[PDB]
Amino acid sequence: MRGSHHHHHHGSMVTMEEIRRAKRAEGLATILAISTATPPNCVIQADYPDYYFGITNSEHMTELKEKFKLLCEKSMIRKRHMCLTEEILKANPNMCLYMGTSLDARQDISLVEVPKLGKEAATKAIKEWGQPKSNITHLIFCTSAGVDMPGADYQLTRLIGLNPDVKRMMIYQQGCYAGATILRLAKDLAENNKGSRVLVVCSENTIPTFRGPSYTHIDSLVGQALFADGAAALIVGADPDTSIERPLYHIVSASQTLLPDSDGAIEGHIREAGLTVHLKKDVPEFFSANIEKSLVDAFTPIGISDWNSIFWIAHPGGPAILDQVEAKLGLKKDKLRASRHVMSEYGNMSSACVLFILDEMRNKCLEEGKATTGEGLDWGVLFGFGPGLTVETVVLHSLPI
Template sequence: MGSAPATVGEIRRAQRADGPAAVLGIGTANPPTCVAQDDYPDYYFRVTNSEHLTDLKAKLTRIYYWNKRAHNELHIISGKKSGIKQRFMHLNEELLAANPDFTDRALPSLDARVDIASAAVPELAASAAAKAIAEWGRPATEITHLIFSTYSGARAPSADRRLASLLGLSPTVSRTMLNLHGCYGGGRSLQLAKELAENNRGARVLVACSEITLIAFYGPEGGCPDNILGQALFGDGAGAVIIGADPVSPVERPLFEMAFASQTTIPETEDAISMEITKGGMEYHISNQVPRLLGSNVERCLIDAFDALGVSAKWNDLFWAIHPGGRAILDHIEGVLGLDDGKLAASRHVLSQFGNMSGTTVIFVLDELRRRRAAKQEGKAPEEWGVVMAFGPGITIETMVLHAPGSLEGN
């Protein structure tokens, strides 16, 4: 007599991983053009042929160096007080010379922008992904799922399809594309990767986030203040992460285990952060209330996350990977949570060296964080538990609790 057929529940249990999802490799990449923040006002007005706007340039230069009175709040702006020293960009003077319409938001330049982004976005992502795959240590053909997040293009087949070709992924790879998630795209992608890895035994998920700001670049004349200020805040970059559960030793070496993830939307904040595609590119709005709104809500998200795990956490006993949307956001969160100096050092470093790269940025912070943990002074053990947080339109807050047990410290 044959054995009884398995129940659906038994089949599902067999399909799931035994352990939690873990970060198995991280990679980042930037385009070659680097602009020092102190030089940016002169650079911006020169490349947009706007040097005749002397009054506006003087005004914006003052704003870049902090104009609290004009905003009544700590605004997400650029300059010495922003903590940004430099940013990397795909857009350069040669590209602008070939596309002069990019400097005038009233001209219909969207098609040309999308043409450039459709090639550049997946190529930059491929550079980051190659590094993540190399650290992971297994062939790219063994990636089972791909999640790609960007706001920098709108075309089908999309950037995920092109990236799969560039990397030589299997034709059976399961692809998911996230568009226009903005600064929370990286956090959303990590949570989706966690769920895929834990619910599909043997799955290996490549998360790729890639952004280039030329989709939202134009000159200062006629532009709204949010967009003009954003020209000096946002940078270009790509980040990639390999996620999988039940790591195969000795090839796979987990960096962080993903213990919990959630998404929270702050009520009545639909207009606080917004993005809109127009004939002249992308326009965005960022309210000067964003730091305050986040500061009023992040602790509740953290309490809920650790309560769900049954873990008692003191905020200063954790390691932190916070999306550095701007210095004001980091300052507000640091103050609300009572964090010690240096707790957000990885986020501040990334903001300083790269600016805000939208959803990509949190992957850069994770990469910087793991380097800092590896370099901890002898005799001082790194923190065991940590948090990833990302924020974007909605206002949406992504929260993830990470675990790095003692056995992972040497990674």
């Protein structure tokens, strides 16, 4: 009948609307647990130039070694964790060359290691969350350290013992912005599916990227100074039961954009020689020059324009990027503290960094008695940077401690 409602000519369509109403969640996606893992083996950055040029038979490349020493010194990295050991490299001479035929060997090690390290981080996140693993409805797995069919998502599912009907999304080779990407993904999964609990795992390592030095590619030396191993895990859910679950952050919005005229600035090829990485000298300039446009597009609907009034999580893959953004925007020197703390303690773990940093920030906030998980502030930004060039921008809201 006539009134302030419309009608449907089919009952099945009415049934569809009932289904949709019942299948979806109400609130914003929230982060409920965060955990990290690293391989036990660790290299001290100060000792790495001698170790690296030794193991790659390159002691005679004197100019090159001097450049690498400067790279490791400017890296602002104290230590890095690596599955890759002297023993493993000795058994794989082709990985020690610059472009040796070595993908198969890299793959044979990495494809087992990726979900293994991921499981270690996941188990902890599940333990913090406190709920049975049979309540996890979704899994997001993220890596750039080796592709396989079925993927690391399948391997993790069987390793942990998740429900066979767990809904999986496998995010392969998206590189250093992907830690933000899977937050963008987890937000839509969690908010569109009622009661859904999303396990989010990333796991990165240096197995496919390690290679000997070369005059042909000084940009490769940059990678050898920075890349590191690490895994991180999250439990994400909307509508938390606060009697058993403890929200840490709301995922308010998530954006992604391509930087104009940056085409080709960062490239990564999966080849017979493994994963090759090429970096133009221009990369930090591109990011620092464009980052405010992302801040403005993200925070204008929130009414914020003062970038010192929000808390910051920024992928610290290149120190120059953080340094130039800090200067360009006039950030207070403590804004990127948690970000730089993770880079110093762990190095560039690609997608895992921003999640290490969230954990570091909520931990320090708790033990220093800060008012929020966002260093006492309400609103925050989390950035992923990587190939495209691509900027991922996640707006977060903190929770009271």
